[PDB]
Design a protein around this ligand. Structure first.
Ligand code: NAG
Length: 497
């Protein structure tokens, strides 16, 4: 029930200011009767997920673009939306006073916020850490007797995850991903650079690494936290590049295939955590469908892979059809999940641009393209970063939906936050993407889904500067007459009975 406190920092739009005693928020969900729709709108001009309502009439007065809901045409069901609880995000959140911390967590996970239901958790350190470390740095301890969780986990990440679940509107799913293994298991004996596991799949090195996954899950289970899934490795292709700066662990598609088939798969299966899902790839989509073909065409490996995790750098171009589309065609029964997204890597662009509407549009656009190409989930990177895009021990290069200003006990909600929210808040787990036919060529990006209870949700993004007259038809209800303003994003919701 609290509006956004706008503030400009010289970019295309504003950020919403939050501190220890104030943050913009929503009232509990209130669903209108059949014949009425709810519209949430955000615009570059300043509007932030503002709610309005209107009628769905039997008569059609519009003569422009028409989007027709086709509920009978069913597609993928949604797993959820969320972000990463990296060391950096945790450090930034915990730098605020407790009252502010709660307003930030509520913004993300609460019904008063945008209802995140997914949190990606790095297994030990990555570039968004203030130091390098793994859970077993003590050399040659192949039985992992000295495996343990550091302060980053027990004092920062875990307590914040518990608080998020507590505030959570919906059940939250945890996803774990490792960047590097202890250095004594790597060919190059370093946390980064070009290096992979030593030996070959099946040996003591590969068996210890797989055991590490189990140890990680055990440790977190001791802290009353269970995981929905883990990925086989974060960006496995990065560890094949000479001089790679961040923590990594190289795997060729063939190496991952064998590691999963011979080590990871069996090990997780024979553990008490057998129900945890295993996602392969967890890398850029331009590596598809090749990586998919190499791993999934091997029965011994395929039987352990539940889905394919993909990453994407919004600042770059990548054909979705040749990657996501082709991969779904070749393996229609293996879910596609976006495990990491980020923007601002442009060498000429600042890592953090407070109030950038473009970066927001890149987020919602990416989510729509993903949804239109079978993806069941979209996961952001760092939940929060400081004004310089840190802390990062190597270098700051990406933005974050929420920026924390510790010296002022305040945090800013970027347009990215709201563009993400237009989906995360209104698309609960179990929602199913359905048909939405455009009557003619247009400049809008749109997607329709059906909630588990049968109600409809349609997101419309206008990345152009011109207002677009629009009519949305639901065969069972009628016509919804509206207008998609230039540089705006809308989420429409309505009962179908
Ligand atoms: C920031 O939040 C409110 C809203 O603008 C502002 O009036 C106040 O000065 C700050 N709140 C506190 C006490 O931190």
């Amino acid at each position: 029930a609290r509006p956004c406190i706008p503030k400009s920092f010289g970019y295309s739009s504003v950020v919403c200011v939050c501190n220890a005693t104030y943050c913009d928020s929503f009232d509990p969900p209130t669903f209108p009767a059949l014949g009425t729709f709810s519209r949430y709108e955000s615009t570059r001009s300043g509007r932030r997920m503002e709610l309005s309502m209107g009628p769905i009439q039997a008569n059609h007065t519009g003569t422009g673009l028409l989007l027709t809901l086709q509920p009978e045409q069913k597609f993928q069901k949604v797993k959820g939306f969320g972000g990463a609880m990296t060391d950096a995000a945790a450090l930034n959140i915990l730098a605020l006073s407790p009252p502010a911390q709660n307003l930030l967590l509520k913004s993300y996970f609460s019904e008063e916020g945008i209802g995140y239901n997914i949190i990606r958790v790095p297994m030990a350190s990555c570039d968004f850490s203030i130091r390098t470390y793994t859970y077993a740095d003590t050399p040659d301890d192949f039985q992992l007797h000295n495996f343990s969780l550091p302060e980053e986990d027990t004092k920062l990440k875990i307590p914040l995850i518990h608080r998020a679940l507590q505030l959570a509107q919906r059940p939250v799913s945890l996803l774990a991903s490792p960047w590097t293994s202890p250095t004594w298991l790597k060919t190059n004996g370093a946390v980064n650079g070009k290096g992979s596991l030593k030996g070959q799949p099946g040996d003591i090195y590969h068996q210890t690494w797989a055991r590490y996954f189990v140890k990680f899950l055990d440790a977190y289970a001791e802290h009353k936290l269970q995981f929905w899934a883990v990925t086989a490795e974060n960006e496995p292709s990065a560890g094949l590049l000479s001089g790679y700066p961040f923590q990594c662990l190289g795997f060729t598609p063939e190496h991952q295939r064998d590691f999963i088939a011979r080590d990871l798969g069996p090990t997780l299966a024979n553990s008490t955590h057998h129900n945890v899902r295993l996602l392969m790839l967890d890398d850029q989509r331009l590596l598809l469908p090749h990586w998919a073909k190499v791993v999934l065409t091997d029965p011994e490996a395929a039987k352990y892979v539940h889905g394919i995790a993909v990453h994407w750098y919004l600042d770059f171009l990548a054909p979705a059809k040749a990657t996501l589309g082709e991969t779904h065609r070749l393996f229609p029964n293996t879910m596609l999940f976006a495990s990491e997204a980020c923007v601002g890597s442009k060498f000429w662009e600042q890592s953090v641009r407070l109030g950038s509407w473009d970066r927001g549009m890149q987020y919602s656009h990416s989510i729509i393209t993903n949804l239109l190409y079978h993806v069941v989930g979209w996961t952001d990177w760092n939940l929060a970063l400081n004004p310089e895009g840190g802390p990062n021990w190597v270098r700051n290069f990406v933005d974050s939906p929420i920026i924390v200003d510790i010296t002022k006990d305040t945090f800013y909600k970027q347009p990215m936050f709201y563009h993400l929210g237009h989906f995360s808040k209104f698309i609960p787990e179990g929602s199913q993407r359905v048909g939405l036919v455009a009557s003619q060529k247009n400049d809008l990006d749109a997607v329709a889904l059906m909630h588990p209870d049968g109600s409809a949700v349609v997101v419309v993004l206008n990345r152009s500067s011109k207002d677009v007259p629009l009519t949305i038809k639901d065969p069972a209800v009628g016509f919804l007459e509206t207008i998609s303003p230039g540089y705006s994003i809308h989420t429409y919701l309505w009962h179908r009975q």
